[PDB]
Specification:
binds magnesium ion; beta saddle; monomeric; signaling protein; alpha/beta; binds phosphoaminophosphonic acid-guanylate ester; Rossmann fold; P-loop
Length: 170
Amino acid sequence: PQSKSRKIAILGYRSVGKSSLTIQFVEGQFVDSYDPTIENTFTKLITVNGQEYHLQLVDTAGQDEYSIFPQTYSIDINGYILVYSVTSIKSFEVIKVIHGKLLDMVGKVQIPIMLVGNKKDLHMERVISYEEGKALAESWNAAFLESSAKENQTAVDVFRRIILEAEKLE
Ligand SMILES: Nc1nc2c(ncn2[C@@H]2O[C@H](COP(=O)(O)OP(=O)(O)NP(=O)(O)O)[C@@H](O)[C@H]2O)c(=O)[nH]1
Ligand SMILES: [Mg+2]
């Protein structure tokens, strides 16, 4: 089928760069203008392994330990991107909770899940090691990748990987 449509949800704690990472991929630039997000949606077109896709990305509002996991992000979502900031132990802690809830909500369905450690560029502020987040991604039997919302190639690698990870379960 010349084109396929997939809906991806980008979840995580606030300020980690869910939007930055999303816009970088979608528009190609890096915005510094920190705007708390309500919910944005961009429809990006990208091809993976010859197959072109129609990606409907849902850049969600940041949540935390005690926040209801939106039931709509529980249905009709083909892939999930759970991003944390390697410069924040709190984001790391929180993503484990969001992941927990997410799994409960969705019940038992083979939905691709990948873990992203954002802000690899800010070397002087990293507190989470690569090997650590990596280990988490393995415990979830999920994909892992680190990234910078200022390093397009890596942002693109993120959205490519999830689809790779998805067409694998289908
Ligand atoms: N140096 C650097 N800064 C980054 C990176 N990703 C995001 N940031 C910065 O971190 C801040 C928050 O990013 P943003 O995308 O708004 O985070 P968010 O998770 O979408 N926040 P919210 O949940 O409130 O909607 C911005 O000022 C942004 O420029 C990165 O890879 N490197
Ligand atoms: Mg946002």
